[PDB]
Each structure stands twice: as structure tokens, then as C-alpha cells.
Amino acid sequence: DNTTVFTRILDRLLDGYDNRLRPGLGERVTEVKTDIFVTSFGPVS
Amino acid sequence: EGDVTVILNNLLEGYDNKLRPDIGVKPTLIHTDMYVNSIGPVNAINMEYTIDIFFAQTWYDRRLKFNSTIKVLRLNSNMVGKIWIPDTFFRNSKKADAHWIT
Ligand SMILES: *[C@@H]1O[C@H](CO)[C@@H](O[C@@H]2O[C@H](CO)[C@@H](O[C@@H]3O[C@H](CO[C@H]4O[C@H](CO[C@H]5O[C@H](CO)[C@@H](O)[C@H](O)[C@@H]5O)[C@@H](O)[C@H](O[C@H]5O[C@H](CO)[C@@H](O)[C@H](O)[C@@H]5O)[C@@H]4O)[C@@H](O)[C@H](O[C@H]4O[C@H](CO)[C@@H](O)[C@H](O)[C@@H]4O[C@H]4O[C@H](CO)[C@@H](O)[C@H](O)[C@@H]4O)[C@@H]3O)[C@H](O)[C@H]2NC(C)=O)[C@H](O)[C@H]1NC(C)=O
């Protein structure tokens, strides 16, 4: 019963969710904040 | 739900991606385009050259017709596997692959 509290939340989040559409499709522009952590700069061919 | 969700769920119900548009009516006219990015090295010992392109195809499908205020449904690659795409292959390609990252 301990895991059902988060299982119900995760099932409610994807209930009716359409993954084909970006968020704010009809009202705004989806802004994506990105950064890069280079773990190792490999050899240059 | 919403506007684009019900439009896509109404387009894709009763849809067979196995059958091309106008299967028993007329040939499907496909307008192709291409945008070369960087023709790579021309290998002479192995007799091939590498090319990187943006291969684009355009056709008509009467089953993918919707009447709403939305003009264009700009979709990602997730909707490719649900609709019909012509089996365009390159007749002189020794090896080729699309790009799958990210
Ligand atoms: C014989 O056996 C081999 C091995 O089992 C069979 O080959 C395999 O075939 C299956 C089925 O087609 C493939 O599954 C699909 O793979 C693609 C991605 O393919 C890319 O990644 C492959 C994995 O890469 C591994 O290895 C490399 C090595 O460098 C690593 O770097 C990677 O990290 C991985 O560890 C890679 O192998 C592919 O390259 C090969 O294939 C290409 C084809 O174009 C050739 O050019 C290459 O030379 C090479 O041979 C390639 O880079 C996935 O995208 C597929 O998932 C989608 O499609 C599924 C089916 O529709 C669907 O269920 C999924 O949800 C998913 O759908 C999504 O994407 C679709 C794309 O349009 C959308 O339409 C859709 O809506 C949705 O968004 C799937 O997982 C195997 O990868 C492939 N593996 C190999 C090794 O070739 C072979 O078929 C068998 N032969 C026979 C005749 O039985």
C-alpha cells in the first residue's frame, strides 16, 4: 500500500496525456533550457 | 483532450497504414525534394561517395483530411509509425542509415 500512493499519482499524470503534442500548443512557445556537461573531450580525427 | 488530440484520434481511427491512398483508383503522385548538407569523401579504391541530405517527400492522402481552424499539424517522428509512407529506397546505395539521436 506504500507504493500505491505514488503509483496512483503516476497513473493520474499520464491519464489523458497526449505525447504527440508539445506543451502550450495553442497558447505559447515551448522554451527549452539546456546545458552541456562534457565528461571527456575525445580524440580529434 | 483538446483540439489537436481529437483531430488526430479522429484521423487515425479506421485507418490502415498498409494500404496506400487511392489503392484501386489512381497512382499516388509524390513530389520529392532534397537539400544536400555536405557531400563527403569520394572514395576511389572502394568506388563510392558519402552524402548527407534532408530527403523530403510530399503526397496527398484523402484519409488525413480534417476541417478545423488549425491549418497545419506540425508533428514529430512519433506519428510516422501510424500513417502510410512510400517505401523509397536508394538503388545505388551500398549502406545508409538515418540519424536517431536524441
Ligand atoms: C536480424 O537481427 C537484427 C538484430 O535483431 C535486426 O535488426 C534490428 O531490427 C529492429 C527492427 O527494425 C530494430 O529495432 C528498431 O531500431 C530502431 C533504431 O535503429 C537504430 O538503432 C539501432 C540500435 O543501435 C544499437 O547498436 C548501435 C551500434 O553502434 C549502438 O550505437 C546503439 O546505441 C544501440 O546499442 C541500430 O542497430 C540501427 O542501425 C541498423 O539499422 C539501420 C536501419 O536504417 C541501418 O541503416 C544500420 O546500418 C543498422 O543495420 C539504427 O541506428 C528504433 O527506432 C526502433 O524503434 C521504433 O520502431 C519500432 C517499430 O515500429 C517501435 O515499436 C518503437 O516504439 C519505435 O518507434 C518510434 O520510432 C519510429 C521511427 O519512425 C516511429 O515511427 C514511431 O512512431 C516511434 O516514434 C526499433 O527499436 C533494431 O534496432 C535492429 N538492430 C540492428 C542491430 O540492426 C534485423 O531486422 C533482423 N533481420 C531480419 C531479416 O529478421
Swiss-Prot record, chain A:
It comes from the Eukaryota. Glycans are attached at N2. It is found in: Postsynaptic cell membrane; Cell membrane; Cytoplasmic vesicle membrane. Functions as a receptor for diazepines and various anesthetics, such as pentobarbital; these are bound at a separate allosteric effector binding site. The extracellular domain contributes to synaptic contact formation. Belongs to the ligand-gated ion channel (TC 1.A.9) family. Gamma-aminobutyric acid receptor (TC 1.A.9.5) subfamily. GABRA1 sub-subfamily. Heteropentamer, formed by a combination of alpha (GABRA1-6), beta (GABRB1-3), gamma (GABRG1-3), delta (GABRD), epsilon (GABRE), rho (GABRR1-3), pi (GABRP) and theta (GABRQ) subunits, each subunit exhibiting distinct physiological and pharmacological properties. Interacts with UBQLN1. Interacts with TRAK1. Interacts with KIF21B. Identified in a complex of 720 kDa composed of LHFPL4, NLGN2, GABRA1, GABRB2, GABRG2 and GABRB3. Interacts with LHFPL4. Interacts with NLGN2. Interacts with SHISA7; interaction leads regulation of GABAAR trafficking, channel deactivation kinetics and pharmacology. It is linked to Epilepsy, childhood absence 4: A subtype of idiopathic generalized epilepsy characterized by an onset at age 6-7 years, frequent absence seizures (several per day) and bilateral, synchronous, symmetric 3-Hz spike waves on EEG. Tonic-clonic seizures often develop in adolescence. Absence seizures may either remit or persist into adulthood. Epilepsy, idiopathic generalized 13: A disorder characterized by recurring generalized seizures in the absence of detectable brain lesions and/or metabolic abnormalities. Generalized seizures arise diffusely and simultaneously from both hemispheres of the brain. Seizure types include juvenile myoclonic seizures, absence seizures, and generalized tonic-clonic seizures. Alpha subunit of the heteropentameric ligand-gated chloride channel gated by Gamma-aminobutyric acid (GABA), a major inhibitory neurotransmitter in the brain. GABA-gated chloride channels, also named GABA(A) receptors (GABAAR), consist of five subunits arranged around a central pore and contain GABA active binding site(s) located at the alpha and beta subunit interface(s). When activated by GABA, GABAARs selectively allow the flow of chloride anions across the cell membrane down their electrochemical gradient. Alpha-1/GABRA1-containing GABAARs are largely synaptic. This is Gamma-aminobutyric acid receptor subunit alpha-1. The chain holds residues 37 to 81 of 456 of the full protein.
Swiss-Prot record, chain B:
Glycans are attached at N67. It is found in: Postsynaptic cell membrane; Cell membrane; Cell projection, Dendrite; Cytoplasmic vesicle membrane. The lineage of its organism: Eukaryota, Metazoa, Chordata, Craniata, Vertebrata. The extracellular domain contributes to synaptic contact formation. It comes from Homo sapiens (Human). It is linked to Developmental and epileptic encephalopathy 74: A form of epileptic encephalopathy, a heterogeneous group of severe early-onset epilepsies characterized by refractory seizures, neurodevelopmental impairment, and poor prognosis. Development is normal prior to seizure onset, after which cognitive and motor delays become apparent. DEE74 is an autosomal dominant form with onset in the first year of life. Gamma subunit of the heteropentameric ligand-gated chloride channel gated by gamma-aminobutyric acid (GABA), a major inhibitory neurotransmitter in the brain. GABA-gated chloride channels, also named GABA(A) receptors (GABAAR), consist of five subunits arranged around a central pore and contain GABA active binding site(s) located at the alpha and beta subunit interface(s). When activated by GABA, GABAARs selectively allow the flow of chloride anions across the cell membrane down their electrochemical gradient. Changing R20Q: In ECA2 and FEB8; abolishes in vitro sensitivity to diazepam. It comes from the Eukaryota. This is Gamma-aminobutyric acid receptor subunit gamma-2.
